[PDB]
């Protein structure tokens, strides 16, 4: 059955500006390294994004629901600043969820990433950079702008939100996302 508006996805009363160009559908994944659903969803969203390719503009935004997890948002943007996000991120998820290493401090992050081939000094310089600080503050602003209260949350074209909170299953989130993107492409949404 086709997804329904209000149950399987939410039409934001205040849509946000989309960064994707014309011809591409913007897809934003609000996630948290420590959220088990986000870890469980990673392979699904990765494959789906790669399959879509030039049809979408995918980005992730880290979420720090409490102050304790701001270091995870700094980690996200620090890995991006170093250009090693795609490579070491699976090890980051594994460290948090399977090795009981929650990577909650810059030092623990640096040590672990050192075991993954990342120079401690370069990573810490990125972690404490003003640019990463600004990106983290911006990610909090976006959490507010999109009215995100849970993760993982998928936002399509800055207007339609979905996720396991709406679909009760990660597969359901994927199916709704694919539907939403295709609806936007056909100009039906």
Experimental method: X-ray
Give yes or no for a contact between 93 and 76, defined as CB atoms under 8 angstroms apart.
Answer: no
Rounded Cα gap, residues 106 and 18, in angstroms: 32
Contacts of 149 by beta carbon, 8 Å cutoff, 6+ apart: none
Please spell the DSSP secondary structure of the chain, one letter per residue: ----BTTTBEE-SS-----S-TTSEEEEEEE-TT-HHHHHHHHHHHHHHHHHGGGEEEEEEE--SSGGGHHHHHHHHHHHHHT-HHHHHHHHHHHHHTS-----SHHHHHHHHHHTT--HHHHHHHHT-HHHHHHHHHHHHHHHHTT--SSSEEEETTTEEESHHHHSSHHHHHHHHHHHHHHHHTT--
Give yes or no for a contact between 170 and 178, defined as CB atoms under 8 angstroms apart.
Answer: no
Rounded Cα gap, residues 45 and 51, in angstroms: 10
Rounded Cα gap, residues 154 and 135, in angstroms: 19
Give the domain range for residue 69.
1-189
Domain count, the chain: 1
* C-alpha distance from residue 41 to each of 27, 35, 137 (Å): 15, 10, 25
Rounded Cα gap, residues 177 and 112, in angstroms: 34
Answer whether the bond into residue 152 is a cis peptide, omega within 30°: yes
Rounded Cα gap, residues 86 and 83, in angstroms: 8
Beta partners for residue 57, in sequence order: 26
């Amino acid at each position: 059955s086709a997804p329904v508006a209000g149950k399987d996805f939410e039409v934001m009363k205040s849509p946000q500006p989309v960064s994707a160009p014309a011809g591409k559908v913007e897809v934003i994944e609000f996630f948290w390294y420590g959220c088990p659903h986000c870890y469980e969803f990673e392979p699904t969203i990765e494959a789906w994004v790669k399959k879509q390719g030039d049809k979408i503009a995918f980005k992730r935004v880290p979420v720090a629901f409490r102050d304790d997890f701001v270091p995870h948002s700094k980690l996200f943007y620090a890995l991006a600043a170093l250009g090693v996000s795609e490579k070491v991120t699976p090890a980051v998820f594994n460290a948090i969820h399977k090795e009981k290493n929650y990577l909650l401090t810059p030092q623990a992050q640096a040590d672990f990433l050192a075991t993954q081939g990342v120079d401690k000094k370069k990573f810490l310089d990125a972690y404490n950079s003003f640019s990463v600080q600004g990106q983290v503050k911006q990610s909090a602003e976006l959490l507010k702008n999109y009215n995100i209260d849970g993760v993982p949350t998928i936002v399509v074209q800055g207007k339609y939100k979905t996720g396991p909170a709406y679909t009760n299953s990660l597969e359901g989130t994927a199916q709704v996302l694919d539907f939403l993107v295709k609806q936007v492409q056909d100009k039906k949404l």
